[PDB]
């Protein structure tokens, strides 16, 4: 019975929903309740969208948030998830003056690659990975959450006429107007998050589509047909883009050893077709000495 649960506090704000911590007034059980408003007051959610969401209840992995229940009405979609206390953004901020320790960076990266390898094998993308979307617990786990699946599945989410989007983790093929996404978009985002854990600063904090593109280009070099065959045929490519030279990855994430820099370079490959897959990245030598430390969380 999903009304013995009462809202305790607002957890966060997604791109189309607000999330609450909800507590069972008799058992104490706590869940995360995501409420997504729709663009309609009467028409509800299409059955085909509910079909696709509901299948994810039975596709489970330790590094993906668990979807517990799907509830829909004439004007709202509610998704009930397992609750975790903290996220990677908050943990980064607490660790910012010192740095998340390397063994924990490596463990979190490995786990997130395991989660992506799973969803990608089931033909599901995340599409909007950001540190605030990665949930952590006292036991050393990290989990993919806040998947960007509402529009992909046809949920008629409310349109926000003045929406402010964070573009910092967006793959360059999206910014250049690619008509079809691939699983490689999530590897790019995760590479950006990897670099952010190491350097304690977002890698490409752009403030518009062109500023995001130009920040990538000023670091990795303006892409051309040599490094990204097909780039000049992307819908938003402009031959008039300024031509910046590529910076060495030794300058991009300096403290990182050559094993880590090599993996990062494969995660940030311009061509999505040659960007490393999550499954291949799990075999990279950077992970030879991976362990599972626990963070010190102050809850
Ligand atoms: O996280 C969200 O907010 C979210 C939003 C919508 N939506 O709005 O349509 C739909 C699904 C969502 N999460 C699914 C989490 C999930 C469980 N098992 C999986 C297996 C593979 C890939 C993903 C998952």
Numbering used by the authors: 0 to 298
From the paper:
CDK2 is a member of the CDK family of kinases that control the cell cycle and is activated by binding E-type cyclins at the G1-S transition, then by A-type cyclins in S phase. CDK2 also plays a critical role in meiosis since Cdk2−/− mice are sterile but otherwise healthy, making CDK2 a validated target for non-hormonal contraceptive development. In this paper, we describe the development and mechanism of action of type III inhibitors that bind CDK2 with nanomolar affinity.
The carboxylic acid of 1 forms a charge-charge interaction with the side chain of the catalytic residue K33 in the hydrophobic interior of the protein, the same residue that engages the sulfonic acid in ANS. Due to the strength of this type of interaction in a nonpolar environment, it is likely crucial for the binding of these allosteric inhibitors. In addition, the carboxylic acid is held in place through polar interaction with the backbone N-H of F146 of the DFG motif.
